[PDB]
Amino acid sequence: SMDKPSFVIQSKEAESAAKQLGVSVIQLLPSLVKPAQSYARTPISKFNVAVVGLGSSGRIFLGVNVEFPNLPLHHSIHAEQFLVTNLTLNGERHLNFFAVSAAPCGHCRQFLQEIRDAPEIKILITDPNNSADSDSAADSDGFLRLGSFLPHRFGPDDLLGKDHPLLLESHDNHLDLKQTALAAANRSYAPYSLCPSGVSLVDCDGKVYRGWYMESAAYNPSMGPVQAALVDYVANGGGGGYERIVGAVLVEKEDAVVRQEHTARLLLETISPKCEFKVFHCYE
Amino acid sequence: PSFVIQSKEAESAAKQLGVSVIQLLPSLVKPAQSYARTPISKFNVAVVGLGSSGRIFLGVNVEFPNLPLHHSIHAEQFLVTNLTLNGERHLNFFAVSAAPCGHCRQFLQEIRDAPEIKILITDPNNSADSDSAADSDGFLRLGSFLPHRFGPDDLLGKDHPLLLESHDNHLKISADLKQTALAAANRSYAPYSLCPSGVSLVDCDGKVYRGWYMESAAYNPSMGPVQAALVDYVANGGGGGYERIVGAVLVEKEDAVVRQEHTARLLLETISPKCEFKVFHCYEA
Incomplete structure (x- = not known):
């Protein structure tokens, strides 16, 4: 029961799978990273990066990196961005945890700053070559909050004063x-x-x-x-x-x-x- | 105001003031902000850096009012391009007007010994200073800004950096x-x-x-x-x-x-x- 995961896993199907393995729902994330890497459409780099996240609703979302050949690299979409888009389309209000196959780049860590309480987002890196899980401020499971990954950030507050995030009900009025x-x-x-x-x-x-x-x-x-x-x-x-x-x-x-x-x-x-x-x- | 200050002209100015070239950097951040072509954000970000040669380079953010935002060039990237064209081998210090975004901190990872690059932020609202790993002057090494990075080593092994003499061979099939x-x-x-x-x-x-x-x-x-x-x-x-x-x-x-x-x-x-x-x-x- 660890092969070919869905891109969005329901709460009832997630907590049940964790209960049979004896682990926590949080601790189930890094187990979903490896099989999700097969979904990676990486024609250019041939470098598969997957990220599986957990929201406040209990639903498990997946994020995968995609690339576009014969185009400049700024058209490519990293795995972290995919996760944000995926849960936003499903109307997920909050994102607290995610396990990623490789160390998130600064490009994505800066992108995550659009979420409210972004520094409080705990992050686990699957890559055995990376040692973020062994930081002095790491979790008991190896998670490290985004605030430590991007300290002294350049957030939205530097350009705005008191605003609404992206995961909220962004509904501006404008007018088969x-x-x-x-x-x-x-x-x-x-x-x-x-x-x-x-x-x-x-x-x-x-x-x-x-x-x-x-x-x-x-x-x-x-x-x-x-x-x-x-x-x-x-x-x-x-x-x-x-x-x-x-x-x-x-x-x-x-x-x-x-x-x-x-x-x-x-x-x-x-x-x-x-x-x-x-x-x-x-x-x- | 000049984009490149010569080593002989920089070390001389510091010697006449009796101070070091390093403590001289953050004074040039404010006037350099005027060069920012920012029609969109109206947010001027300047960065003045110092290389190993002793020359002082400037970096300023530029924007394009008719292109998607991923065409815009931040101040940090501007600085890198500027010193490469002048053949600067290393980058050790730079004082920036505002906190560098993750997009730039990731971009700077292409330089050899990038985490050892000490950084000072002029913005008083920002608290990069007084960090647990901050300098005695308020500088903070880039490694602390982007810890547990995703560097070139994750895709490559024993290669040449970005600031070195990259010389790939290519030929062809208003003459100059x-x-x-x-x-x-x-x-x-x-x-x-x-x-x-x-x-x-x-x-x-x-x-x-x-x-x-x-x-x-x-x-x-x-x-x-x-x-x-x-x-x-x-x-x-x-x-x-x-x-x-x-x-x-x-x-x-x-x-x-x-x-x-x-x-x-x-x-x-x-x-x-x-x-x-x-x-x-x-x-x-």
Whole structure:
């Protein structure tokens, strides 16, 4: 019962599996890391990184790194970012623990700062070559809180004063293949630059997907709207990259500050030639 | 205000004040913030660093108001590009206006002995100082800023760093524009994906520029080839015109692994309508 795990594991199925092994639900995380590495679509690096996290609801979420060949590296999505997107799409309110296959890069540790109480997030690293589990401030299970991984951070408070996180009910008000990409943009997260984005995708078997746009205090570690929609295809989907068809809406103000129009098409046309146009017209 | 202060001019200024060059660094952070082209954030971040040669380098963050945020270049990355173009071998100290993001702390891991780099933060609201591992001057080594890192050693074994003399061999298939972009790709740093890149730029008065490609163990914190040439414009330039004329680039022979061709033009055509073609010609792969 340790092969081919689901990308989202229900609370009843998780605590039961831990009870038969005699371990805790927290202690079950590193046992789910190794099999999840097979899901890694890494054409470039051939380096499989998986991360399995636990929320406050009790549900177990999975995160996996994906890469895009023939594109610049900043189009690639790390495992840590995948986990955040995965639980956000399922409406998970909190993230407390996660076991990762390898030491999280600074790019991801900076990205995690968008979550409330981010430094309190305990982290365990599976990589035997890494020795974070043996730190002087480590847990009794080897977990180490994110605050120790990224001390003296550059958080959202450095640009804003008293704001809402990304995992909360981000629902800004603004106004059928395109009708689904509207509700995706409503759940976007861009408090630094006021440019939300929502991306929906269809399948050859008629599966509806979604993606939005979540910003970080540091600009570069931003999760692309298209990229956040491709995670809804690999997980809970068929698993195909040259089978993308539909495009989606971009809520720019006359293409104001953060244009993702041309970058979306450039990305899709390289991974799937049979792409469609986009509509960059939305207000409020 | 100058982007590069010579060792003879730096050590002299410190000798006349009777102080050390190290304690002289944080005074240059504040005025350097004015160079920040930040149309989006309106948040000026400057960083002044000191190398092993004794020369003082400056780093400043730049933003692009018509591109996605992952095209923007932070102050720390600017500093790295700046000293590599001047052939600085090592980086020991730098005082930064604000707490360096994880994106930059991960990017700095490409330098040999990166964790030993002591860091001072000017921002009084930040509490990097008084750390359990803080210096007697308030400096904190980068290793404490990004502990238990994901370094190059996780993907490589016994290799050359980023600050060393990286010299990969590549040949080809406005005559002094492609000849300069050839030697630029030769000084590139891409040991993870074997795709070097060199970008040259011209001026209205005919000034030849250059830009590397420096890769990171983590993919996203990658320094773009065009961006690393754009830092050669902000520094050692007029300060600053986005109305210049493209230009050059050297990518792989028929787009091997990491194609940046179409993305390069996409960046340039938005900031400067007067763009040029690209050269996908490199050998000895």
